[PDB]
PDB file of C-alpha atoms in Angstrom:
ATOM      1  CA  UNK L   1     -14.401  -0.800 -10.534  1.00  0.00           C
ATOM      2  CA  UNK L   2     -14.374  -1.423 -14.513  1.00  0.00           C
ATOM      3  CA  UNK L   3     -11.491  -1.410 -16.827  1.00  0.00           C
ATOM      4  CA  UNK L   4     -13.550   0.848 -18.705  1.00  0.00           C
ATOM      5  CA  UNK L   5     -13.732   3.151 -15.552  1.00  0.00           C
ATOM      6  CA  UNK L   6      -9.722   2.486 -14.600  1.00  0.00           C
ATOM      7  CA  UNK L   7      -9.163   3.674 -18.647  1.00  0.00           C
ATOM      8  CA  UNK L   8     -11.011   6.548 -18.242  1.00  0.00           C
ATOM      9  CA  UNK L   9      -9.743   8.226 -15.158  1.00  0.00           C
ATOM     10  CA  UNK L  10      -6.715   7.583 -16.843  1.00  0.00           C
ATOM     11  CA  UNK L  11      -7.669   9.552 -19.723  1.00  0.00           C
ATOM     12  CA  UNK L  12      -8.727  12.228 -17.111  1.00  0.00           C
ATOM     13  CA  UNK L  13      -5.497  12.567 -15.244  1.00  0.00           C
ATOM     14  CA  UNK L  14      -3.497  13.092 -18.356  1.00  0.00           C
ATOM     15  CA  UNK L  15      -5.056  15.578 -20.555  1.00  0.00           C
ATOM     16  CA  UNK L  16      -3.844  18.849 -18.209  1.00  0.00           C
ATOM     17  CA  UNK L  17       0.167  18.993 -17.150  1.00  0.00           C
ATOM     18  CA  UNK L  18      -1.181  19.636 -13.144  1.00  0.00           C
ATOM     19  CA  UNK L  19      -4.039  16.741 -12.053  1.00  0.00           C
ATOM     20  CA  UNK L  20      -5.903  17.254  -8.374  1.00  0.00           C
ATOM     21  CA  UNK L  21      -8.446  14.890  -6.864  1.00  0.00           C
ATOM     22  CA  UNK L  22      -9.912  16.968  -4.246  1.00  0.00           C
ATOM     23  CA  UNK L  23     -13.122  17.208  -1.929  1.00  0.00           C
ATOM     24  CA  UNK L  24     -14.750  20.018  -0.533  1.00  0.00           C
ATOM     25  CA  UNK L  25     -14.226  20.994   3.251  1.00  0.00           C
ATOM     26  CA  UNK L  26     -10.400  19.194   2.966  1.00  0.00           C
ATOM     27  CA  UNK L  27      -7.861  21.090   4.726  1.00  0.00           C
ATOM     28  CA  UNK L  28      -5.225  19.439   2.567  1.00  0.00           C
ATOM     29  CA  UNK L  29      -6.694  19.739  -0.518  1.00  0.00           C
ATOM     30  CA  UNK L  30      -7.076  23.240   0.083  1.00  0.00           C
ATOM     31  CA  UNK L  31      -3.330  23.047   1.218  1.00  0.00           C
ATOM     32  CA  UNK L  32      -2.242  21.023  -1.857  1.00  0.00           C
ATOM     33  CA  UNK L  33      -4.320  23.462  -4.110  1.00  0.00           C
ATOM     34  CA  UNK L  34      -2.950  27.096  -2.233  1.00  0.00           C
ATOM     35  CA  UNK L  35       0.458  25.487  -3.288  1.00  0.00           C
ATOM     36  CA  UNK L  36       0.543  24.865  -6.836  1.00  0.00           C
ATOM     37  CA  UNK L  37      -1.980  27.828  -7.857  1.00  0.00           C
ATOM     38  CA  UNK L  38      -1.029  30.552  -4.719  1.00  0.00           C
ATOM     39  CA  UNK L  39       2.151  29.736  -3.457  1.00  0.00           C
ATOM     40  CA  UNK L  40       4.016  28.394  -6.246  1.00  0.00           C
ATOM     41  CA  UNK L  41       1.706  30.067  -9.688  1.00  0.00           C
ATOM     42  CA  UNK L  42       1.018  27.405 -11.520  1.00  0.00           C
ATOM     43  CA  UNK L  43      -1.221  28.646 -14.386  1.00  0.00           C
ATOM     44  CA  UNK L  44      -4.811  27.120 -13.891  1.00  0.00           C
ATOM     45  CA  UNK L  45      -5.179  26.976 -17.369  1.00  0.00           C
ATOM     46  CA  UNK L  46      -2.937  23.936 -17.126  1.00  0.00           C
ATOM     47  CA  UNK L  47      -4.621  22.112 -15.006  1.00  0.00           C
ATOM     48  CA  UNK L  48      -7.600  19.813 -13.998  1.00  0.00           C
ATOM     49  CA  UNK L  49      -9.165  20.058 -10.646  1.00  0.00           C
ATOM     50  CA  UNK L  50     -11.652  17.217  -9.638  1.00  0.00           C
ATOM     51  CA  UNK L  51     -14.180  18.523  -6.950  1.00  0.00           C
ATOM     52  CA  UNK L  52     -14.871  14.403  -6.494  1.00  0.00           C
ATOM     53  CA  UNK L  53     -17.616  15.120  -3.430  1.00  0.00           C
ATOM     54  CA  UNK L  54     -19.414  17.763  -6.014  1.00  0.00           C
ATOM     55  CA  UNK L  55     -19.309  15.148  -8.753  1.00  0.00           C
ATOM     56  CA  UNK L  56     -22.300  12.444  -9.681  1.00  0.00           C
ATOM     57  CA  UNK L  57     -19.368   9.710 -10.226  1.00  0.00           C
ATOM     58  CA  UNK L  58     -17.574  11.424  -7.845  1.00  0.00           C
ATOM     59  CA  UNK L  59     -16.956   7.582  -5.771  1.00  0.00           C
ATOM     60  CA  UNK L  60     -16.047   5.510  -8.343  1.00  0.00           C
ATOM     61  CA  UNK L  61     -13.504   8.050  -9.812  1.00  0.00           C
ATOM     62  CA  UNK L  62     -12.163   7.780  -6.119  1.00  0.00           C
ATOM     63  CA  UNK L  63     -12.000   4.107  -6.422  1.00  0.00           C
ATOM     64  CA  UNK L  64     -10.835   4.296  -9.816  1.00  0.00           C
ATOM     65  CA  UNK L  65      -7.821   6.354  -8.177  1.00  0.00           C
ATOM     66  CA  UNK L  66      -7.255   3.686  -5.644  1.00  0.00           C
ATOM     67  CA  UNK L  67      -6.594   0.777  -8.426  1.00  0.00           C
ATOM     68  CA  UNK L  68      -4.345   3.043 -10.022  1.00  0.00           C
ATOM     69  CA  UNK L  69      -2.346   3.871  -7.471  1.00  0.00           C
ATOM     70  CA  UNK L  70      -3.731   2.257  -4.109  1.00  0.00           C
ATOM     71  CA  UNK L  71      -3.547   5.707  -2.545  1.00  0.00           C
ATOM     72  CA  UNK L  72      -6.975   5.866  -0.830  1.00  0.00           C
ATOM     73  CA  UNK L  73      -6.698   9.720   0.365  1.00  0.00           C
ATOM     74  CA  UNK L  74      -7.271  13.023  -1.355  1.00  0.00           C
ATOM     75  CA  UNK L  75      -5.676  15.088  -2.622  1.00  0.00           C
ATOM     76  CA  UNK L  76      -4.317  13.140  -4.797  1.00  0.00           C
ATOM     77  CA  UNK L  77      -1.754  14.815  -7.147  1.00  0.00           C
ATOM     78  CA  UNK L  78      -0.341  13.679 -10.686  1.00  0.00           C
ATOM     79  CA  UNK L  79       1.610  16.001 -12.398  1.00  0.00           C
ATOM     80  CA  UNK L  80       2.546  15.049 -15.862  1.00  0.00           C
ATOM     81  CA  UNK L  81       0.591  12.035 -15.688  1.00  0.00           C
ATOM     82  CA  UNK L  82       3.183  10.795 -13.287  1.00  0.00           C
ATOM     83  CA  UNK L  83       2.000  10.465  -9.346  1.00  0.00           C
ATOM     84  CA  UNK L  84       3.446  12.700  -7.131  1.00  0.00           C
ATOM     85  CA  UNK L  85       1.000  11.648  -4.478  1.00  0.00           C
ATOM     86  CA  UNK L  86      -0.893  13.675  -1.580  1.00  0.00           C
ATOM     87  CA  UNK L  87      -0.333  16.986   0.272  1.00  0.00           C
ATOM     88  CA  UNK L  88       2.742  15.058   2.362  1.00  0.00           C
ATOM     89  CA  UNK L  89       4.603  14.095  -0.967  1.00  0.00           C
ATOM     90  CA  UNK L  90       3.547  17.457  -2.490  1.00  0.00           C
ATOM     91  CA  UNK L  91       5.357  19.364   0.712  1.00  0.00           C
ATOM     92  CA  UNK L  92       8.502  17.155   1.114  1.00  0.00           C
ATOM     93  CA  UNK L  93       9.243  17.751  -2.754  1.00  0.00           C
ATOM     94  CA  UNK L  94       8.235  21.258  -2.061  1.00  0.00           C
ATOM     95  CA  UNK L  95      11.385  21.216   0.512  1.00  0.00           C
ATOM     96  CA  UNK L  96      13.559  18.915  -1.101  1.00  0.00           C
ATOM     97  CA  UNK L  97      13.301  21.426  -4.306  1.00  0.00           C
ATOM     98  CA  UNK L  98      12.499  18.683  -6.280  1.00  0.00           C
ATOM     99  CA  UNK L  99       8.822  20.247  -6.947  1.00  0.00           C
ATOM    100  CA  UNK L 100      10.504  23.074  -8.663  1.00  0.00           C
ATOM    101  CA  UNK L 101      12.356  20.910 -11.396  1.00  0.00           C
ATOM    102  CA  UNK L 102       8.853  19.018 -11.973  1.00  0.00           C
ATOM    103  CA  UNK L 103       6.992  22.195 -12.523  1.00  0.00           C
ATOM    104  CA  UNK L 104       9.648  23.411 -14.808  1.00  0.00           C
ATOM    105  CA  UNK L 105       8.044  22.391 -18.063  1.00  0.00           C
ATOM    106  CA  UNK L 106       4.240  23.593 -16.899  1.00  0.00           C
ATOM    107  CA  UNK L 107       6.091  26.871 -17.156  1.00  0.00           C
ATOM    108  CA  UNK L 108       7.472  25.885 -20.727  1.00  0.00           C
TER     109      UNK L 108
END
């Protein structure tokens, strides 16, 4: 994958406070996503959502996302622009209450 590519997806993952690389028919990206937006009402208006499987660059943004972080799976989670990781990380800092303090300023 480029730099030009790496830059980019970047770019992507920090214009919105909540950032979601998903695919379709994922049972923890519909986990990950039923969290922030269902469970915990995290305005969607603040956040991006990346359908990766619906989108023509769909695989390099996924390998893209790799370089970044070498996380290979989806979802894959940033909130901030900081990596929180995938729907594991996203639960044990749902439990640990740590989650809560992170979303803090997406409610700001």
């Amino acid at each position: 994958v480029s730099q030009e590519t790496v830059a980019h997806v970047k770019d992507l993952i920090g214009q919105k406070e909540v950032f979601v690389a998903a695919k379709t028919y994922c049972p923890y990206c519909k986990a990950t996503l039923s969290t922030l937006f269902q469970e915990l009402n995290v305005p969607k208006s603040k956040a991006l959502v990346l359908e990766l499987d619906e989108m023509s660059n769909g695989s390099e943004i996924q390998d893209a996302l790799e370089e970044i972080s070498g996380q290979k799976t989806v979802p894959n989670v940033y909130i901030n622009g900081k990596h929180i990781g995938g729907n594991s990380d996203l639960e044990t800092l749902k439990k640990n209450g740590k989650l809560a303090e992170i979303l803090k300023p997406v409610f700001q």
